[PDB]
Design a protein around this ligand. Structure first.
Ligand SMILES: CCC[C@H]1N(C(=O)c2cnccc2C(F)(F)F)CCC[C@@]1(Oc1ccc(C(F)(F)F)cc1)C(=O)N1CCN(c2ccccc2OCCO)CC1
Length: 86
């Protein structure tokens, strides 16, 4: 599947070195991961919990925090911020 991130998600992804406009779901996940890692959007205490209440990430996703294990919930949140392309 080829996806075109919407402007705000595009800006967030491009800010961590993503060069293109069209991505695969694995590329969005990778670049979203680089974003979490650089900005340090997690606690040493709980590695699996992303804390994003005060970040553009939580705004686009619509949640204060989420578990890295909640794959289905993460896709739902990402899907809202993209358009599927040819
Ligand atoms: C080796 C660690 C890499 C993971 N990682 C950490 O777990 C981590 C390490 N140290 C400290 C803090 C963290 C912290 F905080 F949990 F992130 C470091 C960053 C990359 C990494 O995590 C995320 C996390 C959130 C998102 C986002 F999309 F925003 F939800 C995207 C990627 C990842 O590539 N996968 C693979 C893709 N996974 C995934 C998510 C949703 C749907 C499907 C998925 O795929 C399953 C196939 O493997 C998530 C984990």
């Amino acid at each position: 599947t080829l996806v075109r991130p919407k402007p705000l998600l595009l800006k967030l992804l491009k800010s961590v070195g993503a060069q293109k406009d069209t991505y695969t779901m694995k590329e969005v996940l990778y670049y979203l991961g680089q974003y979490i890692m650089t900005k340090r959007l997690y606690d040493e205490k709980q590695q699996h919990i992303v804390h994003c209440s005060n970040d553009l990430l939580g705004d686009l996703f619509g949640v204060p925090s989420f578990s890295v294990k909640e794959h289905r919930k993460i896709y739902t949140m990402i899907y809202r911020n993209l358009v599927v392309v040819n």
